């Protein structure tokens, strides 16, 4: 049910950093939940700012939140928001490149001293690609506020050297991120553990989180 399927390569620096991050941040692997929930919260803020000049962007779905769900059989964790969403060009510009400034130096500054690592991670957002610390496949389904449902976007990657993008019909506004968990990462199928991790981060993040 996809149209315009295209494979694109990660930029070289991005590819190398992704690979380094999976190792260097493993002792703080739960940080991906901070990163994805933070992104949902920003997406909600963006929707609200845009909606100032166009109330219809709420689409009658005004209660903004992020929903977390689990599939034990498929070994997936899904983080889904009804924030601003992304167009195809936004997906390519933001999830394609995504060479976050300072990331290289940040990762190189991590090491065996867990106290220094915790201090660093507390001060720097690694972003979306943190998902690959715990997941061997990440799939995004998104549809931007005000856009026709037929102009949704699919994005998928194994976090190696490429991703695939396509057009999809997505009736609901926002971004749904599905993580297929790596072997050994069943921690993130435990609703209590995930709720607990998120609650600690939710002290600084301003968007309601619903754990299914």
Ligand X SMILES: Nc1ncnc2c1ncn2[C@@H]1O[C@H](COP(=O)(O)OP(=O)(O)O)[C@@H](O)[C@H]1O
Part in contact with ligand X (CB under 6 A); list of ranges 4-12, 32-40, 48-56, 184-192: 32-40
Part in contact with ligand X (CB under 6 A); list of ranges 12-20, 80-88, 186-194, 196-204: 80-88
Instruction: State which of residues 22, 110, 127, 138 lies at the interface with ligand X (CB under 6 A).
Output: 127
Question: Which one of Mg ion, ligand X, none interacts with residue 175, CB within 5 to 8 A by kind?
Answer: ligand X
Question: Which one of Mg ion, ligand X, none interacts with residue 158, CB within 5 to 8 A by kind?
Answer: none
Question: Which one of ligand X, Mg ion, none interacts with residue 47, CB within 5 to 8 A by kind?
Answer: none
HEC-encoded secondary structure of the chain: CCEEEEEEECCHHHHHHHHHHHHHCHHHCCHHHHHHHHHHHHHHHHHHHHHCCCHHHHCCCCCCCEEEEEECCCCEEEEEECCCCCCHHHHHHHHHHCCCCCHHHHHHHCCCCHHHHHHHHCCCCCCHHHHHHCEEEEEEEEECCCCCHHHEEEEEECCCCEEEEEEECCCCCEEEEEEEECCCCHHHHCHHHHHHHHHHHCCCCCCCEEEC
Contact positions with Mg ion (CB under 5 A) in 31-60: 39
Q: With binding defined as CB under 6 A, does residue 175 bind ligand X?
A: yes
CB of 20 to Mg ion, least distance (A): 18
CB of 136 to ligand X, least distance (A): 19
Contact positions vs ligand X (CB under 6 A): 35, 39-40, 42-43, 81, 83-86, 94-95, 98, 100, 125, 127-128, 175
């Amino acid at each position: 049910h996809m149209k315009g399927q295209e494979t694109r390569g990660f930029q070289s620096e991005v590819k190398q950093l992704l690979h380094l991050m999976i190792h260097s941040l493993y002792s703080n692997k739960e940080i991906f939940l901070r990163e994805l929930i933070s992104n949902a919260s920003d997406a909600a803020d963006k929707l609200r700012f845009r909606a100032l000049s166009n109330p219809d962007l709420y689409e009658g779905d005004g209660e903004l939140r992020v929903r977390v769900s689990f599939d034990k059989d498929k070994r997936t964790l899904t983080i889904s928001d009804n924030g601003v969403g992304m167009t195809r060009d936004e997906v390519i510009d933001h999830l394609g490149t995504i060479a976050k400034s300072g990331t290289k130096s940040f990762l190189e500054s991590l090491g065996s001293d867990q106290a220094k690592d915790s201090q660093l991670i507390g001060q720097f957002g690694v972003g979306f690609y943190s998902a690959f610390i715990v997941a061997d496949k990440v799939t995004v389904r998104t549809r931007a506020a005000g856009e026709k449902p037929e102009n949704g976007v699919f994005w998928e990657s194994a976090g190696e050297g490429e991703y695939t993008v396509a057009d999809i019909t997505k009736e609901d506004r926002g971004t749904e991120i599905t993580l297929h968990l790596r072997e050994g990462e069943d921690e993130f199928l435990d609703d209590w553990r995930v709720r607990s991790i998120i609650s600690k981060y939710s002290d600084h993040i301003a968007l309601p989180v619903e754990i299914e």
